Each structure stands twice: as C-alpha cells, then as structure tokens.
Design an enzyme around this catalytic site. Structure first.
Site, PDB file in Angstrom:
ATOM      1  CG  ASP A  67      -0.641   0.040   2.457  1.00 25.69           C
ATOM      2  OD1 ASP A  67       0.538  -0.238   2.695  1.00 25.69           O
ATOM      3  OD2 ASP A  67      -1.434   0.455   3.317  1.00 25.69           O
ATOM      4  CE1 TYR A  69       7.442   3.811   1.599  1.00 25.89           C
ATOM      5  CE2 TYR A  69       7.237   5.009  -0.462  1.00 25.89           C
ATOM      6  CZ  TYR A  69       7.893   4.101   0.319  1.00 25.89           C
ATOM      7  OH  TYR A  69       8.998   3.396  -0.254  1.00 25.89           O
ATOM      8  CG  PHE A  80       8.849   0.475  -3.924  1.00 23.55           C
ATOM      9  CD1 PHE A  80       9.268  -0.046  -2.693  1.00 23.55           C
ATOM     10  CD2 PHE A  80       8.179  -0.373  -4.832  1.00 23.55           C
ATOM     11  CE1 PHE A  80       8.971  -1.361  -2.319  1.00 23.55           C
ATOM     12  CE2 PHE A  80       7.913  -1.691  -4.496  1.00 23.55           C
ATOM     13  CZ  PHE A  80       8.324  -2.202  -3.237  1.00 23.55           C
ATOM     14  CG  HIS A 190       9.532  -6.142   0.748  1.00 24.81           C
ATOM     15  ND1 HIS A 190       9.941  -4.977   1.343  1.00 24.81           N
ATOM     16  CD2 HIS A 190       8.438  -5.817   0.019  1.00 24.81           C
ATOM     17  CE1 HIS A 190       9.162  -3.966   0.961  1.00 24.81           C
ATOM     18  NE2 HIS A 190       8.270  -4.453   0.104  1.00 24.81           N
TER      19      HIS A 190
END
Length: 230
Positions: A67, A69, A80, A190
């Site tokens: 999702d 920030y 990102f 990740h």
C-alpha cells in the site's frame, strides 16, 4: 466521474469493465466518506498516477508494492517512490544499495522520486492505492485488490514481454496470475530492512534488463536524475 480524469486510452480500453463495475462504485463511495473523516494518502488526483505515467502499451516492467506510504508528503500514486525533498524510506534505501552493486556505475541520488522509471515503462503499481494517515493496511480488502488484480491481468494479456518483479510474500501471491508465454517473473524477499538478507545479492535490475534484451526489448535505464523535478 466513471472513468478517472487524465488516463491513457489503452488503460480505458482495459479497465472500463472495472470502472463501471459495482465494486468500484462502492469503493469510490467509501473513499468520498473516508476523506471527510480522515486524511487519506495519496491526494485524490494522484491515486492513479502509475497508470498515467506508464500507459499499458509502454509497460516493460511491473514492480508491485503493498500500500502507499502513510505519512505526510510521502506517497504520490507510485509504488516505492516518494516526493522530492522527502527522506528516502528504508526499503528504497536498500533498493539503492542493491542498484549500486548491481548496475555498474549507478549513482545513488539523495532523493526518493522515481517518475523517471515510470516515464520509461516501469509500472510502479501498489496492490492497494489508498491509506489512512498513520495506519498501514487500513484500506486493505475494500476493493483495490480486485482493481489492481485486473491491472495485473491486463498487463499479463500483452503479447510483448513484461518482467514482473515480485518482492516479498504479498507480492509473490500474484505469481499465479502471470501466465503469458513471453513474460518473466523475478522473485525475491522484500527490500525491507526486516527481510533485507533475502533481497541483497539478488540482482533484480540486471536480470530485468537481461530478460528484456533477450526478447528484443530495450533495457531500463535505472539511473535517476541527480536533482528533481516536480
């Protein structure tokens, strides 16, 4: 209202079925209501910026986040990335460490803004496109996942090779949707500091460019401008 504002024409073809569907009207009603009780990120006009900067016909790479920030001024409608002048988040800093080791001559910038990857075919898609300030996963299972699954399947429908970069356990659940014969799935842990030992040394950025090159496609220039540009 039905089709969002400044959207490329290939994504209209593709996603009209989604935009006119019941689950999507209920989602936007939800959001209308959420925005009068809470601060929601990103701003309404940015929610679909991934699709604006990267028309379906220009998608070479799909980099899936979870999702947005959830702090002030971070999220701007791309996975990102953050706005210029905002501290680079921990996952993006690791992305940069790996880029410096993976792409000979890559120079880490001081900023976190990735519109230049978007403007050259990197679809920077979150699975969930909105969030309440302060509250991760607060708009999980409200309808964004049906929508972003349909973005994903439309990209999978392309004949031309797309590299799907799936980092971490949420993202890797989409591997099943990638069935197209010419597509490539690059998977690893990740970039998050919680999982960084399963991300460093994976060389996703060079493997991506190598895969594109094999299919006769052009590589991504991963270098970011030194200064940006909002």
């Amino acid at each position: 209202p039905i089709i969002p504002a400044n959207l490329p024409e290939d994504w209209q073809e593709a996603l009209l079925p989604e935009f006119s569907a019941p689950y999507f009207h209920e989602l936007t009603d939800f959001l209308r209501q959420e925005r009068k009780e809470y601060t929601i990120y990103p701003p309404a006009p940015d929610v679909f910026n991934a699709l604006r900067y990267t028309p379906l016909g220009e998608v070479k790479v799909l980099i899936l986040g979870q999702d947005p920030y959830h702090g002030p001024n971070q999220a701007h409608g791309l996975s990102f990335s953050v706005r210029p002048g905002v501290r680079v988040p921990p996952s993006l800093r690791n992305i940069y460490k790996e880029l410096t080791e993976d792409i000979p001559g890559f120079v880490a910038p001081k900023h976190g803004y990735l519109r230049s990857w978007a403007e050259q075919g990197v679809l920077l898609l979150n699975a969930v496109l909105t969030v309440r300030a302060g509250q991760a996963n607060s708009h999980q299972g409200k309808g964004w996942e049906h929508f972003t699954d349909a973005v994903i399947k439309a990209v999978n429908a392309k004949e031309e090779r797309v590299v799907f970069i799936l980092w971490g356990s949420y993202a890797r659940k989409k591997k099943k949707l990638i069935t197209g014969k010419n597509h490539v799935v690059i998977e690893s842990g990740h970039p998050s500091p919680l999982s960084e030992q399963y991300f460093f040394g994976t060389r996703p950025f060079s493997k991506t460019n190598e895969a594109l090159e094999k299919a006769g496609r052009g590589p991504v220039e991963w270098q970011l401008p030194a200064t940006v540009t909002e």
